Amino acid sequence: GELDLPERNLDRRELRDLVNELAAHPERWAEHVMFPRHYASLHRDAYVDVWLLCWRAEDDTGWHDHDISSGAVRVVAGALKECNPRIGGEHLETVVSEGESFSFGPDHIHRLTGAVHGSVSIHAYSPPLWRLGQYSIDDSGVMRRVSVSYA
Amino acid sequence: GELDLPERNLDRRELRDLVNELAAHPERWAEHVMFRHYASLHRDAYVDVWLLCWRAEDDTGWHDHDISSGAVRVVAGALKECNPRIGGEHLETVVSEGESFSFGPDHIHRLTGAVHGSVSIHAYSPPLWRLGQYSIDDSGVMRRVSVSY
Ligand SMILES: [Fe+3]
Ligand SMILES: [Fe+3]
Ligand SMILES: [Mg+2]
């Protein structure tokens, strides 16, 4: 079935424990490994959403926030680049490789890209990722944020 | 006070029309000028309309309006509207008395540098239930705090 999680929101630390423990339980996700993006929902209810992501080298989230959702990421196989925006334009880039995880609160703005072909990652959000902010730049250079429904 | 409007969220052109219409009807807002101090002119399921009196120190900070379109009419004085540019050389526009502007729901801006005693009318649709307020670390990494209002 779906995952058997608490009936409440999880904080950042709890979300990071969740994605790491799921990674140690391939019975919960191996079936859903599928390469195109391709994402597969492992769990979606009123408190938490969990997705399994299978990456191609070209895949790119764009710059986004998660509105009011905290989140965590565990890389199961391969490696991703987590990028954080800086107003100067010299953005911070970190490689996250197999075995590693990180979490963030709801104020986070980031971009995931640069994956090794075939990478696999588990992403959890609490409260659920029902809204995402997608940033874009005009030819002027002026930045905008489009709020998108993900429910 | 109730406003004769379509029973639906309004677009940015409709909101600009609204703020300019209200600016032409001082009988509706003149009583509420007070020196941002703010007075609600009308709030319902579809729109929020505010009168704002500015001091020279007032500053919204950088923010978005989540899913709300908006419009501003400067009734007296002047405001600076600024729009952020990657690179740090932000676009700045002085909006003087008599002038108005509107924007869709993707806008990021900051209002500040008001002549002392400026008066403006602001309308949002859908209502401004949530705002995103941007901040930096001393590292320089930008964050967005979602504020319920
Ligand atoms: Fe994300
Ligand atoms: Fe605003
Ligand atoms: Mg165990």
- CATH code at B102? 2.60.120.10
Q: Which helix (H) or strand (E) holds B70?
A: strand B69-76
B111 in a structural domain: yes
Which of helix, strand or coil describes residue B13?
Answer: helix
A2 in a structural domain: no
B48 in a structural domain: yes
Distance CA B134, CA B145 (A): 6
The whole domain housing B23 covers 12-130
| Neighbouring C-beta atoms of residue A23, cutoff 10 Å | 20
For chain A, what is the domain count?
1
Distance CA A75, CA A68 (A): 23
* Closest-approaching ligand to the CA atom of A66: 1
Resolution in Å, one decimal, please: 1.8
A95 in a structural domain: yes
B1 in a structural domain: no
Q: Is the dihedral of CA B99, B105, B106, B112 positive or negative?
A: positive
Q: Judge contact between A75 and A97, C-beta under 8 A.
A: yes
Find where tokens 């334009």 sit.
A89
Report which DSSP code applies to A22: H
Find where tokens 């030819």 sit.
A139
Which candidate, A53, A50, A109, places its Cα nearest to that of B142? A109
A85 in a structural domain: yes
Identify which of B86, B136, B140 has the shortest CB distance to residue A137: B86
Distance CA A17, CA A13 (A): 6
Report which DSSP code applies to A58: T
Radius of gyration for the alpha carbons in chain B, expressed in angstroms and rounded: 15
B21 in a structural domain: yes
Identify which of B66, B88, B135 has the shortest CB distance to residue A88: B88
Q: How was this structure determined?
A: X-ray
A19 in a structural domain: yes
